[PDB]
Amino acid sequence: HMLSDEQMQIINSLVEAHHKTYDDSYSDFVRFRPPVRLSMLPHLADLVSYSIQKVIGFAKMIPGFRDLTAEDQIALLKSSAIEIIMLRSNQSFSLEDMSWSCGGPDFKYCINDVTKAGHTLELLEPLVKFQVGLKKLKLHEEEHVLLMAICLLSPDRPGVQDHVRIEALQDRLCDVLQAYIRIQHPGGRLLYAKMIQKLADLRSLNEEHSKQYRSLSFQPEHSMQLTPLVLEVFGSEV
Amino acid sequence: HMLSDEQMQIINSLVEAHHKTYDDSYSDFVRFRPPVRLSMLPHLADLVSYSIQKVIGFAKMIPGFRDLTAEDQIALLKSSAIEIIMLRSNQSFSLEDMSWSCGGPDFKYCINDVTKAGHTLELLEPLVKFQVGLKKLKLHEEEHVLLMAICLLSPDRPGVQDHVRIEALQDRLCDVLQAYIRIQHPGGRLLYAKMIQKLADLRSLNEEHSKQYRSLSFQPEHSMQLTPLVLEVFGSEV
């Protein structure tokens, strides 16, 4: 019926962490290789690279992530990177346009623009469908941030070693979320469940992304357009 | 006293090759990460990467380069890349500004701009000094192109295997140059020699570059700003 002092300080450091790693003006977007309408690939690879940096910045501020071994910090960031990106992107996604609108007509990413980056419209439909659903949940900033931290700390991942310590951290976070909705969110009686279902949805979006990325990464003429960080984070190296 | 039909067709395919890989309008420069005044590093790494692509395109059209093994084609491109870049850059270098002027006030690279890309003004002075000298030679397009092809086909290089076949190719090119100056260049009686001296000069500029690049390449926060192609071409891998 009331969130504890420690559940509150977890919400605090997490929203502050998101505030320091997410710019609603999208100012830095001008430093990327320009969008061209695979003409969109250099801009979108620059965008994904910049976002991996922010996901890293955010992750480092999740209570307990820092305590983990360098190895587990990497295993989790590698596997969840694309999922955190897709979640955080919702903050820019509009239902009125069915696009990710980032402060400008040049940083407005519609389905057709993502197609000119190697990808197939058939594999783009589950992403926009996932983005419509997420937006329809009309999440509070605390819930959104909590969903990214729970997603990042997921145990079911290739390379993770301390599957007991991160399951512990994810549960302490799931606990903060479940209590937050009940206390602070009216009409949210079935929200916790609706959100956990989005984590599973993301796992499927992740597979489909990994397959599409594999296609690009093997063609050196496309791989060369990527950044060292994207190559490293999405690469198979152990 | 007269260039042979075969010395002429070597000049032809070489100037045509340079025409297809060098854009005097510098239009593609807008597709790079923007210049910022190490703020210049993303733009300059994008510039060097784009130029490696053009040097590759050019190399492929040098008569006899294509016949070489894939390995030697690589050994030569890796070692000479920076030198071909420095030579080809002269076409944009101005004596009136002491800068590389590329169709725009944003693509005007002065000494101070190159400093904000990791490099030290002390190691920049031999480059501009090399650029003043090269420009003072007032080379014909045929001589300039011939100098890049001779530079690329240099035998004294790490990794080269067929040191007899490329020395042969470089000499057949040196022959075309020496005859061209005598027949087609008035007051060039000491030009061939002045130019060969620039190849040696470049070798010193290359060492100094390799040392400076090593400094950047080891710091992952700087290396991440580079491109896959720059990393590959300037990397130690064999």
Binding site: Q53, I56, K60, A70, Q73, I74, L77, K78, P228, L229, E232, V233, E237, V238 | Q219, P220, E221, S223, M224
Partner: peptide
Amino acid sequence: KHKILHRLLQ
């Protein structure tokens, strides 16, 4: 292996 990730995580 993962030189950038390591630097960024420190």
